[PDB]
mmCIF file of C-alpha atoms and ligand atoms in Angstrom:
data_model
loop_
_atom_site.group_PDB
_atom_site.id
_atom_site.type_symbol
_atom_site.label_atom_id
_atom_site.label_comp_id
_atom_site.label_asym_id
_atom_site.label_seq_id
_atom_site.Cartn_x
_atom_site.Cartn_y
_atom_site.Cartn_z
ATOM 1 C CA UNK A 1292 -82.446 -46.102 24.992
ATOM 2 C CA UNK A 1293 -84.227 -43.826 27.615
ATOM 3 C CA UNK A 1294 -84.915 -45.776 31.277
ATOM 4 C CA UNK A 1295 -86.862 -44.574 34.265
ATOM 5 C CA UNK A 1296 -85.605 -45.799 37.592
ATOM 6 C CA UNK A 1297 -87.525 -45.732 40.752
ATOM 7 C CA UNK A 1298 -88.714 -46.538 44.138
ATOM 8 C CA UNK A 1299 -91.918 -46.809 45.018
ATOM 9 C CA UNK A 1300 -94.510 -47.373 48.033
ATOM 10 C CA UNK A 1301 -98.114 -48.685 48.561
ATOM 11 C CA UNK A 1302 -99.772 -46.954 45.486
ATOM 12 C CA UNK A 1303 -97.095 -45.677 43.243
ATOM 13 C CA UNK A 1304 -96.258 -43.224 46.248
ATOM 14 C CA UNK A 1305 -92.714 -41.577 45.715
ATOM 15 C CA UNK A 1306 -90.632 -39.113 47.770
ATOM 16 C CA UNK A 1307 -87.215 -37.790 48.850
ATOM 17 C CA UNK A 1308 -84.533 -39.664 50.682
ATOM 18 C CA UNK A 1309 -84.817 -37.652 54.291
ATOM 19 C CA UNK A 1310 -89.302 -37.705 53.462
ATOM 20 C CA UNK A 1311 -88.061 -41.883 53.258
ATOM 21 C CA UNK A 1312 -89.281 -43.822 56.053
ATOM 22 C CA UNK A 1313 -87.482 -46.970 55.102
ATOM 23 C CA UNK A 1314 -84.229 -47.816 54.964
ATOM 24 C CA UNK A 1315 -82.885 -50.090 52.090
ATOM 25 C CA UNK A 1316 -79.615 -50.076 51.475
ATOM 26 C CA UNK A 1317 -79.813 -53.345 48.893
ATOM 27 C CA UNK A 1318 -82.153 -50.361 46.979
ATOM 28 C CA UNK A 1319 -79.406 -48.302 46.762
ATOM 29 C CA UNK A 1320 -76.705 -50.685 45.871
ATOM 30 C CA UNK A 1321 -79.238 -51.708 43.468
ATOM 31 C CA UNK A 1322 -80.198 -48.076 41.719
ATOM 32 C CA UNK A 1323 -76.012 -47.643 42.086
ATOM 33 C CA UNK A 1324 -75.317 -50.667 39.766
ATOM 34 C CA UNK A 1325 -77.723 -49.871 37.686
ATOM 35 C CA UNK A 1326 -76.768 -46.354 36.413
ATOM 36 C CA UNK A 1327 -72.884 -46.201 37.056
ATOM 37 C CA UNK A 1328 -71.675 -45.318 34.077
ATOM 38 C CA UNK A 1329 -74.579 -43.881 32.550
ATOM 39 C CA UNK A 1330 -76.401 -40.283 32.510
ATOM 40 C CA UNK A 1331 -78.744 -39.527 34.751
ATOM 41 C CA UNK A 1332 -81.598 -37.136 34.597
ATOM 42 C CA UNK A 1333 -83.210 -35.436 37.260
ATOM 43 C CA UNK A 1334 -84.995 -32.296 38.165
ATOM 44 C CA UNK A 1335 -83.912 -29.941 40.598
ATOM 45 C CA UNK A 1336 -85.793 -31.167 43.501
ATOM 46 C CA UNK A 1337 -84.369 -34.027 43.106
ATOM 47 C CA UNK A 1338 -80.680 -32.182 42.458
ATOM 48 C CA UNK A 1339 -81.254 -30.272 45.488
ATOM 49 C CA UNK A 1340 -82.377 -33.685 47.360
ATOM 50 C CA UNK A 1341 -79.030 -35.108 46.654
ATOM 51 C CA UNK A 1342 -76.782 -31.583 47.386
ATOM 52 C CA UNK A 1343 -73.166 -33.152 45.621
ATOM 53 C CA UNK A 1344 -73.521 -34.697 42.074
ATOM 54 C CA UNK A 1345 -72.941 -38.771 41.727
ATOM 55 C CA UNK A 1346 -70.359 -39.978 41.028
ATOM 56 C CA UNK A 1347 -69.448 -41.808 38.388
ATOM 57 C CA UNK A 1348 -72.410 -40.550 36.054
ATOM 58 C CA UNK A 1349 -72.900 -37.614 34.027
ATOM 59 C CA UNK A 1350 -75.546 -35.756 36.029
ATOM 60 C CA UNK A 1351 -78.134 -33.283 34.273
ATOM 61 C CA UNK A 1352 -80.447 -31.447 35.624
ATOM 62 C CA UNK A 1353 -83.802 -31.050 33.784
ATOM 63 C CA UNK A 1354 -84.958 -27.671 34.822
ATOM 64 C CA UNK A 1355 -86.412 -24.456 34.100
ATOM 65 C CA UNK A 1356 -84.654 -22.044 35.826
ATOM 66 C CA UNK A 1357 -80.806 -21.327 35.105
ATOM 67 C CA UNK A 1358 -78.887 -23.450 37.051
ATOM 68 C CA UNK A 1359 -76.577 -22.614 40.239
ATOM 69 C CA UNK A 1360 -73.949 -24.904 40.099
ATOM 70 C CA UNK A 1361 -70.580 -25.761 37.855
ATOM 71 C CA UNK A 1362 -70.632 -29.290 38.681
ATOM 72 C CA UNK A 1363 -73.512 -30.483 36.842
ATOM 73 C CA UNK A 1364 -74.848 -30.066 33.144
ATOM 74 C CA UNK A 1365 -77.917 -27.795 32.919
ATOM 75 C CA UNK A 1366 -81.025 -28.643 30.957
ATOM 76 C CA UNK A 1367 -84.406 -26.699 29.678
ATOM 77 C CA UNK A 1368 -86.598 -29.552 27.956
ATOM 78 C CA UNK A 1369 -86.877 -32.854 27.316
ATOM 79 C CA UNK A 1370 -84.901 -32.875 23.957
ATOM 80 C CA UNK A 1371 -82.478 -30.955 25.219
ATOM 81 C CA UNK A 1372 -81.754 -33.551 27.593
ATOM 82 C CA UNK A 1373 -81.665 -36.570 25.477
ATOM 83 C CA UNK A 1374 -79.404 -34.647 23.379
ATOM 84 C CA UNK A 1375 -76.795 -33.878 26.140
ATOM 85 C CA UNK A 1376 -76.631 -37.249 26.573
ATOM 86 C CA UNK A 1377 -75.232 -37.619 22.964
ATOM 87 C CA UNK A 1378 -75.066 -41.322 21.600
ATOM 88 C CA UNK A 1379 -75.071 -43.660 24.650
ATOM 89 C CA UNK A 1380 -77.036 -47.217 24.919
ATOM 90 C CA UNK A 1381 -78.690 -46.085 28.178
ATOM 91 C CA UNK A 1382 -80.092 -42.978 29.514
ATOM 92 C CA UNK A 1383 -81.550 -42.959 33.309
ATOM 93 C CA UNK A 1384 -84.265 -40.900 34.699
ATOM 94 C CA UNK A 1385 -84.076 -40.354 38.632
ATOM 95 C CA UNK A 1386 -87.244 -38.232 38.848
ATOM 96 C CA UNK A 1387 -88.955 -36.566 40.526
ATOM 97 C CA UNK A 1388 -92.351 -37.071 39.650
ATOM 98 C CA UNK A 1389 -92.757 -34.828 36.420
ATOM 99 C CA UNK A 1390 -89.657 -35.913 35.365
ATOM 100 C CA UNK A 1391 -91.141 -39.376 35.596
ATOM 101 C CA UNK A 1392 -94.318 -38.314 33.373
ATOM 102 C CA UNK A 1393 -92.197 -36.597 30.794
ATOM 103 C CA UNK A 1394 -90.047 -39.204 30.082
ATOM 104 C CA UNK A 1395 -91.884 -42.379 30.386
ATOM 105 C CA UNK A 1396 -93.545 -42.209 27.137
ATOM 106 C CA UNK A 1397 -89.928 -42.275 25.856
ATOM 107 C CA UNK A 1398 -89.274 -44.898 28.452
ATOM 108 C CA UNK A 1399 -88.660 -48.492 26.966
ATOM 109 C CA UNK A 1400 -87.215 -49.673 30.100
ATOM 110 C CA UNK A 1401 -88.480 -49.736 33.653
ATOM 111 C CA UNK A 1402 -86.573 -50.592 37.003
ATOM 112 C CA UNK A 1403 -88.582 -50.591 40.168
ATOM 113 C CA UNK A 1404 -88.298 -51.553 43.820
ATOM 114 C CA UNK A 1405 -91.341 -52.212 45.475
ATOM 115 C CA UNK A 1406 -91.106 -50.982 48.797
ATOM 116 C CA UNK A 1407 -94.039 -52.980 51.289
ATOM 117 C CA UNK A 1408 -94.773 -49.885 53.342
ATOM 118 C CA UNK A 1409 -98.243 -47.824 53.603
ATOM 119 C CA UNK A 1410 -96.836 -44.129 53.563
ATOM 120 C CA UNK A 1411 -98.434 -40.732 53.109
ATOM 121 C CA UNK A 1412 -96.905 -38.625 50.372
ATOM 122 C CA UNK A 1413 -97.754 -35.980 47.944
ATOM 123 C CA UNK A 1414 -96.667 -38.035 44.993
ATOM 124 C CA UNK A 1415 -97.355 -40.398 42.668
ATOM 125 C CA UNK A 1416 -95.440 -42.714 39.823
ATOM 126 C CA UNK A 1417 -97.045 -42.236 36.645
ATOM 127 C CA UNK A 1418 -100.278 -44.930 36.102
ATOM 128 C CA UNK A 1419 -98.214 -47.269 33.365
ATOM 129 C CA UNK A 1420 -100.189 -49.526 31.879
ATOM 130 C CA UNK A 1421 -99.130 -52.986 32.672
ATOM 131 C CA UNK A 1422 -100.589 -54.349 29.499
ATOM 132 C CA UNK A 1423 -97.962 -52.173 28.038
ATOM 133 C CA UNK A 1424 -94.871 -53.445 29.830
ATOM 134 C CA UNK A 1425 -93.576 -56.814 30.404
ATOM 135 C CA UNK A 1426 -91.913 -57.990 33.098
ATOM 136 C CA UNK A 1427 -88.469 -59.278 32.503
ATOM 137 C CA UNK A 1428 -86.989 -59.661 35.880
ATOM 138 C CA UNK A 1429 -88.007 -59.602 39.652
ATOM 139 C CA UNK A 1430 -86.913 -60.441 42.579
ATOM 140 C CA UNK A 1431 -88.642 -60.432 46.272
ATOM 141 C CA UNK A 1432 -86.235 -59.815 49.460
ATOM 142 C CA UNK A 1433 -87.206 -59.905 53.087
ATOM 143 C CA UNK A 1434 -86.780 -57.405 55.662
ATOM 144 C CA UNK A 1435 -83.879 -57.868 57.391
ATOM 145 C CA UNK A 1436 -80.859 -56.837 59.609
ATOM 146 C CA UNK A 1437 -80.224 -54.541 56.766
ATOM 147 C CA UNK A 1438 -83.702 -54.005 54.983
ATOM 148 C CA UNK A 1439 -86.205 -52.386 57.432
ATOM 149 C CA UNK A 1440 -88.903 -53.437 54.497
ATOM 150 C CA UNK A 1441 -89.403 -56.419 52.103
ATOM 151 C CA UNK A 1442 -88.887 -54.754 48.995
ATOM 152 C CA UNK A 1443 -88.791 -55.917 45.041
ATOM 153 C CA UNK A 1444 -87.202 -55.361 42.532
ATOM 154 C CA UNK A 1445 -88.531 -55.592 38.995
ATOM 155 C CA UNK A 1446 -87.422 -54.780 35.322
ATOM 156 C CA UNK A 1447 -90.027 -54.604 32.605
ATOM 157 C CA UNK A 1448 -89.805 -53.847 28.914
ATOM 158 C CA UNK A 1449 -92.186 -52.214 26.571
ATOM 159 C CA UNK A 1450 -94.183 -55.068 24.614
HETATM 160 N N1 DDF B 2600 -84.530 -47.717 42.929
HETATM 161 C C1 DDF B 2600 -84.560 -46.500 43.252
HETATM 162 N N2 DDF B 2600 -84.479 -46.241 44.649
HETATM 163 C C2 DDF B 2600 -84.482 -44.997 45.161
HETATM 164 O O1 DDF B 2600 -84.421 -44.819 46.373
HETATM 165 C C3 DDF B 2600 -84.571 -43.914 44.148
HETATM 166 C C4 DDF B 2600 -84.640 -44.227 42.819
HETATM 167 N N3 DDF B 2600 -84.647 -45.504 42.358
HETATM 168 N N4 DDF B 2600 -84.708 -43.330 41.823
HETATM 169 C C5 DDF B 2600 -84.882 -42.047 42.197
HETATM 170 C C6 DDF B 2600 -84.358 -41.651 43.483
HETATM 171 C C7 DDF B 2600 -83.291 -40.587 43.576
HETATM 172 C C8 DDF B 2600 -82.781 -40.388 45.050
HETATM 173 C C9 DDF B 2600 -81.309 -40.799 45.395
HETATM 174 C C10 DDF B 2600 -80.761 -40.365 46.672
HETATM 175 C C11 DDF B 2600 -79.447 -40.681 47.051
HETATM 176 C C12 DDF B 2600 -78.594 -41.446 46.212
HETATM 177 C C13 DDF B 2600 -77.179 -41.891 46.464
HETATM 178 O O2 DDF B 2600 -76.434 -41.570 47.390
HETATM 179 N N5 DDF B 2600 -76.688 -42.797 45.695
HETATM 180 C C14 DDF B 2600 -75.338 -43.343 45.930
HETATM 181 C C15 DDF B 2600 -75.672 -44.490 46.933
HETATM 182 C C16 DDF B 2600 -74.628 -44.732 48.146
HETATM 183 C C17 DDF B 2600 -74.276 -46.238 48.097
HETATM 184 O O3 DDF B 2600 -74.686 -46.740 47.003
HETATM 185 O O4 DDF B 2600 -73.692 -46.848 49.015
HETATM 186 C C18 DDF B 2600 -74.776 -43.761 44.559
HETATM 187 O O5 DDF B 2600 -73.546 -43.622 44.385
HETATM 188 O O6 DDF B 2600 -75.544 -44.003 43.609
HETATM 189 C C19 DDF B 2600 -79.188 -41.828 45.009
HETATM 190 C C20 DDF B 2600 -80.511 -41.521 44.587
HETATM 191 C C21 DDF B 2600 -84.443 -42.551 44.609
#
């Protein structure tokens, strides 16, 4: 089953840890738990975002280009990638962006934070289509001590 995992801003804005204004920490506990143990896609923006592999997930990197790097798997397409991944119940897909797009029609899951903050960034989460999806969990959090922003976190399924 193929999931797409994400965090996103005022108007499906997305963008790199270090381009991140906020700082969640329950977010990242949160994306932690829920792909430990699974494979994780990603493109190489994103790989290069990141700089070591995570641990405790096979990482593979959908990308074009021949890969630089021993410690991860190396991917050229979308089937290629689902492939890698062999039989396993769930699949995870970081990003970035066009990783996003190419995978959420394959998507049947959908786990997003909400982050409440107005930010300027080049991109965009794919426009789902909410009519689409249901919403099978949430949860709203406060700013706090921790949490610079009120953030929320939400699971939906494809109806
Ligand atoms: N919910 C969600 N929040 C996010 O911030 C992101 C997503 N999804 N999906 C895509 C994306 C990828 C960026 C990204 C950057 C760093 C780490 C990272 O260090 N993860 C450690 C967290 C350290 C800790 O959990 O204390 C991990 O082991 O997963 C993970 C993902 C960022």
């Amino acid at each position: 089953m193929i999931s797409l995992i994400a965090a996103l801003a005022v108007d499906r804005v997305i963008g790199m840890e270090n381009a991140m204004p906020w700082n969640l920490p329950a977010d990242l506990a949160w994306f932690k738990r829920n792909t430990l143990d699974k494979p994780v896609i990603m493109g190489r923006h994103t790989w290069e975002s990141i700089g070591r592999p995570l641990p405790g997930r096979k990482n593979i990197i959908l990308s074009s280009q021949p890969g630089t790097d021993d410690r991860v798997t190396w991917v050229k397409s979308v089937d290629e990638a689902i492939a890698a991944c062999g039989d396993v119940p769930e699949i995870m897909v970081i990003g970035g962006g066009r990783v996003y797009e190419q995978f959420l029609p394959k998507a049947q899951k959908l786990y997003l934070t909400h982050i409440d903050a107005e930010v300027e960034g080049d991109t965009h989460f794919p426009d789902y289509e909410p009519d689409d999806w249901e919403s099978v969990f949430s949860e709203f959090h406060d700013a706090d001590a921790q949490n610079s922003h009120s953030y929320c976190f939400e699971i939906l399924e494809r109806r």
